[PDB]
Amino acid sequence: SGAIYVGNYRVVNRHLATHNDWANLVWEDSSRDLLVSSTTAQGCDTIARCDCQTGVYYCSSRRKHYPVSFSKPSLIFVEASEYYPARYQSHLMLAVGHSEPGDCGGILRCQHGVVGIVSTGGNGLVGFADVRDLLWLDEE
């Protein structure tokens, strides 16, 4: 689990969104595994606006923050899971590292702010859904 709180927005994995998130929906994309909902209180996270390929992510299944190098956001085939059939997921970045399903929502951060959240894993890889292209998260 995990979310990003920026301005009056909440960003979560689409597969973990609550009834309140869907009732207060701003934008969602199944192919990205992302959902953004509105909030009443202001958040404190800052979204990175950059092309960094190194950062640190939180892995709940190790209680550890790991420094990683990661690939640029791309269209990647993701095997079937409890929440989606086998499909291509867009805006996905991979790194060599540990990830289990309940690690989804863990933040990946660089020197500029939040880059994305854990979304995929297995086979010694970890995948992150990028949020740096969602520029509207910085306004209104």
Ligand X SMILES: NC(=O)[C@H]1CCC(=O)N(Cc2cccc3[nH]ccc23)C1
Q: Does 50 bind Zn ion (CB under 5 A)?
A: yes
Q: Does 99 bind ligand X (CB under 6 A)?
A: yes
Q: Which residues pair with 116 in a beta bridge?
A: 108, 130
Of these residues, 21, 91, 103, 104, which one is catalytic?
Answer: 104
Question: Does 104 participate in catalysis according to the annotation?
Answer: yes
Nearest position to ligand X, beta carbon: 121
Of 124, 75, 116, 117, which is closest to residue 95 (Cα–Cα)?
124
Q: CA quadruple 14, 98, 132, 74: dihedral positive or negative?
A: negative
In the region spanning residues 112 to 131, those forming contacts with Zn ion, defined by CB under 5 A, are 112
Q: Which is nearer to Zn ion, 15 or 112 (CB)?
A: 112
* Residue 136: other Cβ atoms inside 10 A: 11
Question: Does 15 participate in catalysis according to the annotation?
Answer: yes
- Among 35, 36, 103, 114, which residue sits at the site for ligand X (rule: CB under 6 A)? 103
Q: Does 131 bind ligand X (CB under 6 A)?
A: no
Question: Does 59 participate in catalysis according to the annotation?
Answer: no
Strands (DSSP E) contained in the chain are 4-13, 25-29, 34-44, 54-59, 64-69, 74-78, 87-96, 107-110, 113-122, 125-130
Binding region for ligand X (CB under 6 A): 15, 33, 78, 81-84, 89, 99-101, 103-104, 119-122
